[PDB]
Amino acid sequence: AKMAFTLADRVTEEMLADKAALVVEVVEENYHDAPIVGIAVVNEHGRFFLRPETALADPQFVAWLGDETKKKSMFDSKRAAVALKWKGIELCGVSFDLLLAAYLLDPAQGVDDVAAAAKMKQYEAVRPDEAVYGKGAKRAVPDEPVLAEHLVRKAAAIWELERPFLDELRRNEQDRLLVELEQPLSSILAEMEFAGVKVDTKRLEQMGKELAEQLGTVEQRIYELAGQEFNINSPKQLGVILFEKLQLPVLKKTKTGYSTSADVLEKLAPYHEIVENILHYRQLGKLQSTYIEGLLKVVRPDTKKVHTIFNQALTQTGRLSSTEPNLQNIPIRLEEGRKIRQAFVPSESDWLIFAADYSQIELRVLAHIAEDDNLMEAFRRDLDIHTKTAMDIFQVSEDEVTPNMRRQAKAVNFGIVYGISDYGLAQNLNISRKEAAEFIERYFESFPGVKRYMENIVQEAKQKGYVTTLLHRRRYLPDITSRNFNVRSFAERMAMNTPIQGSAADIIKKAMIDLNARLKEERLQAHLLLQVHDELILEAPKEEMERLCRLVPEVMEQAVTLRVPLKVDYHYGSTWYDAK
DNA sequence: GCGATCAGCGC
DNA sequence: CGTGCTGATCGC
Ligand SMILES: OC[C@H]1O[C@@](CO)(O[C@H]2O[C@H](CO)[C@@H](O)[C@H](O)[C@H]2O)[C@@H](O)[C@@H]1O
Ligand SMILES: OC[C@H]1O[C@@](CO)(O[C@H]2O[C@H](CO)[C@@H](O)[C@H](O)[C@H]2O)[C@@H](O)[C@@H]1O
Ligand SMILES: OC[C@H]1O[C@@](CO)(O[C@H]2O[C@H](CO)[C@@H](O)[C@H](O)[C@H]2O)[C@@H](O)[C@@H]1O
Ligand SMILES: [Mg+2]
């Protein structure tokens, strides 16, 4: 039966109590400068629905929203906070965010709406958002009666669920993680997203023109060498040309056909001149379609800024993700793509971009957690970790390490940092699974502490059912007991990797909170723009660079205290590209 | 229109 | 046989 509530035509005092579940509904997935379709408030006085036009124009309600002493419980408060920021309204006092609470309790559940979170506690008196709004082209805000009941039911669920969610977090020893880390970070992410990053669109357009030129040249060359025209961007069509018309060997196949991935094309290059051209085409095409045209599509015409959205409740490792646009994967490895970064500039005249990154934070975290004497000593001496790993696994002095040895040691470390299988390592180094496994073995012989940790963490995951990070983030691994070798092995690798990657996530998140506190104490105009897993990107007046060179690295390095030092490198320049 | 498949970017 | 995200193609 329907849920009782007052569909108010004006704001009343009882709607402004010092404790309430609040819903400020933004239906558009991208909430930047998006519409607020409705508001719901549930407190000790009852349940209320308010039309945005009314509430947001009412000075009492606005003041209530901005009053830090008036506590609010919400679901995805960042969405509401940002939508309100675009309307010039401040949201304060959010003491509980159900989305973040559910995320910390179990990232694997994929909770993306109130209904999903509520179902965790057998509460189902609320509908999934998709059921109410639909999806895709059929998505739309329903009539007021339907909308009002939905927002009220969501607010009611939040009101009822706060206590049980907080109680379980306390049992998991995650209450501080929510209240002292994720919730405060949510507000910082809101400011970053709202600020956005300025884009030199003319620069991007110029690069695009140039790429279009090169693409046309290589495209014709490809048809030339192929003896016919075909859709190069079609793995299917390309596969027929390469493996049927040109008879190149089939070294790898996909579930549906011939593989044409770069790793495969690399091996085929010697056989035909068309290959190198296909590779060149893939590189330029990726830049053109994804980084030039893609970025240009989401830049705001009025300010020339891009406003990403950081998904704080998605990854199972505790990392943040970025969308519309994704600003965590802008090219940097190859010089060609790297130039894309020249397009990201300061948002004000005479300001500069400042970037600071942790040096090998994942392996330092591993040295700390595993308490491996060799690895800890390596970082205490601040050694080149890849040269050092090569020295130990290949049993040679430092001057005996060749470039190829270091490359292979670096690939092994990559595998450790990301928890890839011996198969993954074999493909990465183009060697046999046996040889790959062989390197792993040599690594454990030289880093016995790491081997002990891996064995111990796997047993711990099996016994408790989950693994944890430095700040108590948790990840359940039900597959660790599977009688299927591949499935179980993956779970075991995640058991060892999550504490590493997840703790690194915990650290940079706390650094972000500590940094903003310091920037405020110092009254610096500098502010965060982006987080890219192990690095922070800021912009600030050129006159603040010297102070940032000392402040940023220090705050980041001191975020937590490990058995080994943390080290942060930094650079600044006129564009993101120049902050190298 | 929309999901599946394949590709490649940085972490 | 680490991952999330985005874009081009392809078949229903
Ligand atoms: O507001 C971000 C927050 O919303 C969720 C759903 O609760 O994701 C939605 O919004 C994202 C940003 O536009 C989209 O990428 C995603 O597809 C959409 O469902 C959460 O996952 C996220 O933390
Ligand atoms: O000129 C466009 C026309 O060419 C084809 C090949 O016959 O595709 C080419 O151009 C596309 C757009 O630039 C690329 O995506 C593709 O990789 C390239 O081969 C046709 O599909 C298209 O109609
Ligand atoms: O030989 C023991 C060694 O094998 C691993 C897998 O690499 O774990 C296996 O053996 C354990 C018993 O000691 C089981 O609990 C586990 O499920 C099974 O895969 C290592 O963790 C262990 O050191
Ligand atoms: Mg780094």
Structural domains of chain A, with CATH = 1-194 (3.30.420.10), 195-309 (1.20.1060.10), 310-360+505-579 (3.30.70.370), 361-504 (1.10.150.20)
CA pair distance A530, A277, nearest whole angstrom: 35
Residue with tokens 């006085």: A45
**C-alpha pair distances (Å), A488 with each of A363, A387, A390, A461:** 24, 33, 30, 12
Edge-to-edge strand list for the sheet holding A46-50: A6-7, A46-50, A38-43, A19-25, A71-74, A94-97
The protein residue whose alpha carbon is closest to atom 7 in ligand 1 is A112
CA pair distance A291, A40, nearest whole angstrom: 40
Burial class (CB in 10 A: 0-12, 13-18, 19+), A127: middle
Q: Which atom of ligand 1 is nearest to the CA of A309?
A: 12
Give the nucleotide with minimal C1' distance to the Cα of A298: C6
Spatial contact of A35 and A26, defined as CB atoms under 8 Å apart: yes
A527-531 and A535-541 beta bridge pairing: antiparallel
Q: Is the CB of A462 under 6 A from ligand 3?
A: yes
Closest CA to A17 of A69, A55, A66: A69
A326-A332-A333 Cα angle (round to 5): 125
Spatial contact of A526 and A539, defined as CB atoms under 8 Å apart: yes
**Best of A232, A236, A277 to mutate for ligand 2, by most ligand atoms within 8 A of CB?**
A232
**C-alpha pair distances (Å), A559 with each of A316, A507, A509, A522, A565:** 22, 6, 9, 18, 11
Residue type, A560: V
Cite the beta strand spans of A32-191 per DSSP E.
Answer: 38-43, 46-50, 71-74, 94-97
- Ligand having the closest approach to the CA of A459: 3
Q: Is the CB of A452 under 6 A from ligand 3?
A: no
Contacts from A549-553 at CB under 8 Å and sequence distance 24+? A551/A518, A551/A519, A551/A522, A551/A524, A552/A354, A552/A356, A552/A515, A553/A356
CA pair distance A423, A52, nearest whole angstrom: 55
Backbone phi, psi, residue A466, to 5°: -160, 170
Residue type, A510: K
CA pair distance A324, A336, nearest whole angstrom: 23
Burial class (CB in 10 A: 0-12, 13-18, 19+), A45: middle
CA pair distance A78, A100, nearest whole angstrom: 10
Residue A14 in tokens: 């009882």
A359-A360-A364 Cα angle (round to 5): 120
Handedness of CA A322, A471, A520, A95 (dihedral sign): positive
**Core vs surface per residue A323-344: b (16+ CB within 10 A) or e:** eebebbebbeeeeebebbbbbb
Spatial contact of A363 and A549, defined as CB atoms under 8 Å apart: no
A277-A278-A281 Cα angle (round to 5): 85
DSSP for A101-144, please give it: HHHHH-GGG---SHHHHHHTTT--SS--HHHHH--GGG-----H
Whether any strand B atom is under 7 angstroms from the Cβ of A235: the reply reads: yes
Residue type, A489: S
CA pair distance A493, A479, nearest whole angstrom: 11
Whether any strand B atom is under 7 angstroms from the Cβ of A265: the reply reads: yes
Cite the beta strand spans of A383-428 per DSSP E.
Answer: none
Handedness of CA A512, A514, A515, A519 (dihedral sign): positive
Q: Is the CB of A525 under 6 A from ligand 2?
A: no
Spatial contact of A95 and A120, defined as CB atoms under 8 Å apart: no
For A203, the enclosing helix (H) or strand (E) is: helix A201-226
Spatial contact of A178 and A100, defined as CB atoms under 8 Å apart: yes
Closest CA to A186 of A75, A110, A68: A75
Specify which residues A475 forms β-bridges with: A467
CA pair distance A28, A307, nearest whole angstrom: 15
Spatial contact of A394 and A405, defined as CB atoms under 8 Å apart: yes
- Ligand having the closest approach to the CA of A455: 3
Residue with tokens 């060799």: A374
Backbone phi, psi, residue A394, to 5°: -105, 0
Backbone phi, psi, residue A399, to 5°: -75, -10
CA pair distance A399, A389, nearest whole angstrom: 13
CA pair distance A226, A529, nearest whole angstrom: 46
- Separation between the CA of A113 and the C1’ of B5 (whole angstroms): 28
CA pair distance A393, A412, nearest whole angstrom: 10
CA pair distance A324, A295, nearest whole angstrom: 9
Q: Is the CB of A488 under 6 A from ligand 3?
A: yes
Q: Is the CB of A112 under 6 A from ligand 1?
A: yes
Contacts from A552-561 at CB under 8 Å and sequence distance 24+? A552/A354, A552/A356, A552/A515, A553/A356, A555/A511, A555/A514, A555/A515, A555/A518, A556/A356, A556/A358, A556/A508, A556/A511, A556/A515, A558/A514, A559/A507, A559/A508, A559/A510, A559/A511, A559/A514, A560/A470, A560/A506, A560/A507, A560/A510
Q: Counting every residue, how long is chain A?
A: 580
Rg (CA), chain A: 27
Spatial contact of A317 and A501, defined as CB atoms under 8 Å apart: yes
CA pair distance A537, A473, nearest whole angstrom: 25
Backbone phi, psi, residue A537, to 5°: -115, 125
Obtained via which technique?
A: X-ray
Ligand 2 midpoint to CA A232 (Å): 7
Neighbouring residues of A430: CB distance < 8 A, sequence distance ≥ 6: A263, A267
